[PDB]
Amino acid sequence: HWGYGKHNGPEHWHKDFPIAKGERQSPVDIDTHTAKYDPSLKPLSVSYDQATSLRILNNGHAFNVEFDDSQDKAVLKGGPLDGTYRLIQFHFHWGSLDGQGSEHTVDKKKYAAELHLVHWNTKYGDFGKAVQQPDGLAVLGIFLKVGSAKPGLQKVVDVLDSIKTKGKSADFTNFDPRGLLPESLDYWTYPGSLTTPPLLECVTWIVLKEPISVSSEQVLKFRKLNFNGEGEPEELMVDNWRPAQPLKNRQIKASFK
Ligand SMILES: [Zn+2]
């Protein structure tokens, strides 16, 4: 099965998922001097006041914090988007060392990690139908750098001991994702894809310019997770990031001057 190793990592994915070599793959390098300021872009509307987290899951590639998406609660709108996108889950990508881990890069800079808040377009009714559409998902990407602790991340860090291995899940109610947002909602945006198989070209990417800071101790606890299941040879869950893919016929737009 696909993963992040020498024999099953990103350079292999195209064999099972030929769209890996497609025209709108993610992530990409964001060249800040080439990105065009677009005065037509609206402020991002992030409405997470009523978000209902349910559960956290180790899926063998990352951990997902899951939300109840059965009502119009936690929604993303405005920015580059038409209509309303509902939060279904967030997860991270991170490195073995602080010098790598992000999927997007900024002028080739790699951050220590990257947070993805995944939302689906309510006009397609469910997640699975939305990913079959070119405007099906909106993923809000947020860089992590190592410095000061993020107090709003600590509830996530403290539950990871209970989901060390693939297939382990835990009850994870009342988690407020507003505690993971930077001050500024200035962003870059471009059309792209999921960054894991099935690599579907269904995403409007919205990548915030301002990173959040997390402590070395917080990211070290991400790196204690395991890719393997309980009672299998230990493989630390690190370097679960896809490298930058070719930009091809795409424009990255900036919300800010
Ligand atoms: Zn992701």
From Swiss-Prot:
Residues of the site described as Fine-tunes the proton-transfer properties of H-64: 4, 59, 64
Provenance organism: Homo sapiens (Human)
Record-given protein name: Carbonic anhydrase 2
Keywords: Acetylation, Cell membrane, Cytoplasm, Disease variant, Lyase, Membrane, Metal-binding, Osteopetrosis, Phosphoprotein, Zinc
Catalytic reaction list: hydrogencarbonate + H(+) = CO2 + H2O; urea = cyanamide + H2O
Pfam families in the record: Carb_anhydrase
Family affiliation: Belongs to the alpha-carbonic anhydrase family.
CC cofactor: Zn(2+); Co(2+)
Cofactor mode of binding and number, as noted: Zinc. Can also use cobalt(II) with lower efficiency, but not copper(II), nickel(II) and manganese(II).
